[PDB]
Ligand binder design. Structure first.
Ligand SMILES: O=P(O)(O)OC[C@H]1O[C@](O)(COP(=O)(O)O)[C@@H](O)[C@@H]1O
Ligand SMILES: O=P(O)(O)OC[C@H]1O[C@](O)(COP(=O)(O)O)[C@@H](O)[C@@H]1O
Ligand SMILES: [K+]
Ligand SMILES: [K+]
Ligand SMILES: [Mg+2]
Ligand SMILES: [Mg+2]
Lengths: 501, 501, 501, 501
């Protein structure tokens, strides 16, 4: 079984050894990171099934993100397998503040009346919490009495009971027991804060990521096609046109403008953590099925994320609901499933990846019986798409071990992946950027190979590479597609059914 | 519009000029046939849409059949188009006898009591009719009182009211007004006459046809797989293995043994004239839909025949029921529609072919909306069949002007035809026997071409031949299939989508 | 088996005995009608399955039509079975005139030269054929040289070769051997004769028919809804609002206006004879399938007509194409099939009804497997229609012997019939007009009963009537619908599943 | 919106007030139960949508269970709403023992070494954990070194590293940080402990529960139909034949024997907590979808259980995966969803019921678009089932506000519920046992009414009861089913479509 559903694993201190000290150990942050040992841990995750690593710029500074990115490069060499590099931005969001005098939280216990400051560039006291609003907007006039301020994915709730004009402070009452922690999302539902289409912090973080070398950018809180277009401009201006942009849909505006966002973007990341707070929690499942169907229909990449194996942050086994959620996401038709704290911050990062790989592999087996996606309803809008439909027909007609595509830019691979064929898809490409770029497409196994010359037999190369990759053996039937001949073909125009020597 | 449904046209005196005298003219039979003029008439029928000519050995002697066959050869040269040659046998049947003293019929008017002789090798009187039973069986003991003797496709009915042992004669009463004519089918329903699996007259007629050069044999009254196998043995023994055998299903036994007959045969001819008398007339439509579905499922050829444009024997326009029957046969999924008396014996032979071509062409347009055949339900049982399914998918995905196959034996063409693609199928073949052999397959346009060498580009040849044939123009999209490379491919393994220069 | 598909039989001299003489015997016309002997012949057609008799006013005169209708009333008493009475109007048509002297017809040969008069109010001679043009129009200026004049369903073709202005006569050449009989329909394709809105002759014929007592009117050549509305006004004005109007679609204008025509009418008669000459003959099958689907969707009645068993006019058995046509019309979804010359003019009127009943009964058995109609796609537009859908669901769920509806106006029966349930429909109604009115609805067995009182058990009456009818026996399962209770119910609101005691 | 998907809420100390003290407050257990205050808390859960309360006999003792059941009877009076009573048996299971002294639990760290006693009838200490094995079995010889002992739904893992024959103790190493609380389920995968047919403890617990008055029994670890039959015998013997048995499928033996188990039982509880440890965790989603389809096909009840809103035990909002799990269970076709620790042990019992009701209500709205269940494939095996199919057809055909069934035993309501109609189902029944008995059927609103006499208008009563319920208003369309007339009817035989006055 080759795992068709791709895994995005968020990296962080959990797999990072510093000075021989593990995450949570006293004096850990004071130490310098141990690159080779940290690299070996990451390589296990690669071998376990991680197809792309996510670097959340919401937390670590550029030195932290850059060193972690460098470590993944050694991990690829240790593993002998390449992975995608994905950058997740802060976005038009609100996040929290530090405490005075050595405090890191207050036993925020239910029923008390306390305060949240709107004054920007400051820090907190037990009776008054400061919002490090991204950039430095003043939201005092945007929030009315009766609004709710939620801290840490909604773990703790604050009701605005009054507004103090003298200090520009909200007087709030704790609705339940919880923890106030730095760089924590703060959600204030039903609130129209006018944040910028692209904040300078995001612009700078993206440029830093582009200099390091990344393949994908996940843009937090995309509200319109404009949020995508601004990032696209930076990628094109810097000569990084190959970078794919995944819009993060996490609010009503992103949902209202979904069709326009899908058209501008290369894919969607269903950011359920913020979405379930910004919109009614009971509507997220409805939106998730609908987003997956729409993104697939557009031949784009969809990632399901947040709380998928949440319990695995503290325990070696996930809950029944967590396994069900990962299984259903695959059935709904997701290209990829994602791990956040489970891989970044948890006690069982490798176990979380292996557990997700096992469920994803089991669920792929039931796509024929229970799968929601319907390739039969699609309009075939181009000759390459007609070929992708034909390949899917071959995989339905007989037992096909592998579909091989010789693709220059990955277009043929994306269309074949879009059709969800009953076969793994080996994408033979001629450059590292195209190869890494296909890593989140459902069922695609990207493989680097020499660009073919006019005198080469591309069918022979496809069989040779598939055999080298260990994906096929003598007697197996494979479907191979290419644009023949090289140098005259305008597009993928040929389908061959071949029995492996 | 290229006519996908093939037409089988029975030849006869109607298009044959003898001594400058037309059929029906006094002294016509006494004259010698005019080959070139007769050839020009046949060429018009070829141009009108006849894809195969049927020679009924039930009527004319070997000199008549042989000269007619020779005339069709000149017609192909005049027309510039080749047609199939089909031989129809007498079979385990009963046919009628000559009258004494210059009489050719008696105004057989209803209610009289008269006689039918069983004595073989004799001739008739108004009060006593002789049965020229094929070969010379004695059926006197096979027919009981109360049985019905029907003459000329059931046009006239005789009820057996008594049996005279002294003369071995049946005493019958005329049930209705009609004509007793020579070499007329005589049906005696619910009668178990034990005729031979292969009569000597049939064996001799088939050998004569094989010496002349034929592509198909329609075997009258096939009751079991054995009837087909006996003919198959003669074809193989004489070096005529290329000949295809169409079983004629015209009785309950043929219907009971249909699955075995289909397996032994290359196709079925639904001989409705005898079938509608041998079995309840109201069941023929049920059998017709079922036979077409079964033969198509087997990738074999099905021909619907008898009374299709019957009125056109005497009038220039068919009845509403005749047009409906031809239209429905195409909708049911027939490969071919047939003309008997309309082309052989009628006053409007060319008009009958043109009328059938018009209805068949109109009906092909409604196959997507009303067509009974369902390719989706078929098991794809071989790699060439998987390719045929893939070609059908391409024709459904986008507008394909033509499907081209380079086929050595016609196997790929038959499987593509089986799938009923929304396109004409140009079958490029390397010998005349394969070319003529594909003439009754739905949508197949056979074309002769040089056998390809290892250095040829078969895709270029396919486009060149299609353009030469006038079937495609610049900008048209075509699907081309072949076994590449020539000399190493085991079978059709390649599908190419090409835009015509 | 009960025959679900209804039969319309055209009456004429064929079933009539004159002074102990049959049609086709010398001096037949000079003898008075043997009413009782003629009535006995008609009762046999009723017993054989004719559900309605058609009186073609294009033929003969009011006395002949009135006498024939009285004979049918006698035949209903002799058979103990009621039938519908249908009047077929002349419409905006051209008919050949009576001939001077004794002649009823003349035979013509290909190439003969004759004339066609345009002068109205005169009789034909063999050499000069006169026309009865609706509205007494002069068509001389409407017909150019080169136009074709066709006689009797296009059986005989006449070519206009010259025009004589002195006599306003067309000089024509006979194109094929044929007959020109008195009162035969004349078609002049590609001409635009300006026929009137409603000819006075049609107003007279309709008023005469309503006075005799009829249940249906088939309006010839309906061009627009106004043609239906004019007839509707006469039916309403005379207190004959119960009469149902079947628009005859026989020209391009009717096809073009089909939706408005269906909306105005109670049903459609597919008048294939004129339609096949008025429009390309190959399109009639396309139009037939489409009309049947549209009329059924509208919950109205569709009759397929002309040439269904044409050969049975002269012979005891129909052709294979004729049997195919009747079977396919049932499969297409027709409520009724019709006989014209076969029952009015032929040698086998009773046999023709019996043969059609046999084919129709066999075809009904294949509706589940091959039926074109799809009740699943219908919008249920009213509470009675929702009950009709529920009744069909019951018939699909289990073996239902009979559906019984207690209907004051037949609306519930029409809706149940629209749904094509897998059961016979016993329509218990309280007046003879409603009873005769349902005779052409698919599967409906109309039965007269006393109107139920508010103290009656309608479920018990339904079982008793079905049992007395011999339709069901002990242990049979039946579905019964009614509006309960009587006097409070505004519509059929109840469905009962009952086992026969 | 009425919540069609039923909720089972496990009761416990969480909703209980002891001497004016809440769960999670010092000295709570040393205070007498405040019955009235506890009853008021429970009434809120009833108001929020709990349809049945679950009493887990694996926990506490008969006095605690009996007192809790009495409090629920009080809560039913306070809410003016009735709920079902469900008893959950211990079954052939292993549970941790009570601890010596005050301790209810102990915390353990990874790598700690402790022992597990096999001796029965003793209490645990922190260093030596004792087990209550069903049937008081000695499992020492059944467990080898290297086996894993899991505690509390597999939350804590223990590895057997040595066996001490002197004390019959297992030496184990703690594999992950976790807690060992009293009376927690213990799983030892890949072992075959020979549990008895029905433990005497289960016989006692069931008899005690039946005496209190219960409507349902969930049988833990059903291995075969015999497990169901033994409980059934006790219910029947005691005159409690009305009690429904839900087999809990939580091991491979139950999965293997599912068809026989479903046949013996009234329903199935998908006990995912034990099932996820007993079988590969990735297979639970496959088994869940399959069990729901099979139970629904059988016209029986299916409950999905465990970890549905697990995070709500400690927090006010559930995770994204938890919400996905509840939504998917409804989409899969579950009759009911369940709360365990969330309602019995957590800080947010009322909120947990409210959150589940909200998700269940939203999910019901997407059943038309995404529902897995397909009533179209069912065989209608009886006349009442045919009526149920017809009712669903009515709800599909038009906007039906409510379906009302007058059912003596609830059979008609079960059949209507099986069909998943697009409407609420008001079940009018004549006894409280039938009424409580229908509380877990999908979409059924059970309502007590007087048994109708033969002079009563059942249709009028149905409308009046629906109106008094506030379920319908003037102009609403309702479908009513009944067996009419009362005293002659052997089953529901009538369907009425009625508009509310
Ligand atoms: O068939 P389409 O969808 O019009 O795509 C054609 C385009 O795709 C390409 O073939 C790219 O395909 P690959 O990257 O898979 O080789 C371009 O060369 C070409 O312009
Ligand atoms: O794919 P299948 O159905 O096994 O057929 C394979 C056979 O068909 C053939 O390719 C014939 O095909 P063509 O006659 O169309 O060239 C044979 O050479 C081969 O043995
Ligand atoms: K982020
Ligand atoms: K023959
Ligand atoms: Mg977010
Ligand atoms: Mg024959």
């Amino acid at each position: 079984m080759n795992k068709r559903v791709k895994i995005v694993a968020t990296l962080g201190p959990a797999v990072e050894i510093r000075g021989g000290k593990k995450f949570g150990e006293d004096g850990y942050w004071g130490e310098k990171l141990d690159v080779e040992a940290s690299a070996k841990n990451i390589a296990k995750l690669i071998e376990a099934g991680a197809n792309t690593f996510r670097f959340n710029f919401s937390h670590g500074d550029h030195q932290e993100q850059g060193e972690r990115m460098a470590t993944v490069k050694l991990a690829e060499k240790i593993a002998g397998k390449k992975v995608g590099f994905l950058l997740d931005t802060k976005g038009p969001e609100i996040r929290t503040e530090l405490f005075e005098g050595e405090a890191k939280e207050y036993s925020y216990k239910t029923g008390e009346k306390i305060r949240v400051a709107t004054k920007q560039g400051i820090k907190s006291t037990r009776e008054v919490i400061a919002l490090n609003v991204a950039g430095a907007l003043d939201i005092y006039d945007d929030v009315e009495v009766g609004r709710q301020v939620l801290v840490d994915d909604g773990k703790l709730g604050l009701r605005v009971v009054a507004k103090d004009d003298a200090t520009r402070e909200f007087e709030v009452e704790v609705e339940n027991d919880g923890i106030i922690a730095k760089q924590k999302g703060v959600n204030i539902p039903n609130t129209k804060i006018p944040f910028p289409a692209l904040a300078e912090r995001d612009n700078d973080d993206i440029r830093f990521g582009l200099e390091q070398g990344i393949n994908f950018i996940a843009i937090s809180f995309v509200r319109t096609a404009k949020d995508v277009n601004e990032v696209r401009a930076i990628c094109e201006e810097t000569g990084n046109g190959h970078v794919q942009l995944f819009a993060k849909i996490e609010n009503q505006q992103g949902i209202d403008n979904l069709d326009e966002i899908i058209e501008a973007a290369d894919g969607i990341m269903i950011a359920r953590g913020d979405m379930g707070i910004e919109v009614p929690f009971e509507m997220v499942p409805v939106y998730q099925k609908m987003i997956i169907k729409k993104v697939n229909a557009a031949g784009k990449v969809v990632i399901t994320a947040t709380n998928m194996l949440e319990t695995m942050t503290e325990k070696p086994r996930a809950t029944r609901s967590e396994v069900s959620d990962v299984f259903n996401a695959v059935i709904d038709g997701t290209d990829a499933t994602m791990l956040s704290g489970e891989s970044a911050n948890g006690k069982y990062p490798l176990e979380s990846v292996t557990t997700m790989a096992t469920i994803d592999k089991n669920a792929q087996a039931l796509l024929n019986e229970y799968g929601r996606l319907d390739s039969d309803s699609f309009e075939r809008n181009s000759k390459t798409e007609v070929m992708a439909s034909a390949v899917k027909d071959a995989t339905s007609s007989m037992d096909i071990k592998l579909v091989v595509t010789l693709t220059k830019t990955g277009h043929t691979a994306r269309l074949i992946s879009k059709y969800r064929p009953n076969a793994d898809i080996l994408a033979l490409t001629f450059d590292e950027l195209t190869e890494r770029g296909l890593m989140l497409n459902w069922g695609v196994i990207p493989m680097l190979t020499d660009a073919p010359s006019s005198t080469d037999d591309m069918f022979e190369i496809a069989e040779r590479k598939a055999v080298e990759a260990g994906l096929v053996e003598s007697g197996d039937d494979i479907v191979i597609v290419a644009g023949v001949p090289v140098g005259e073909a305008v597009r993928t125009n040929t389908m061959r059914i071949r029995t492996v020597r």
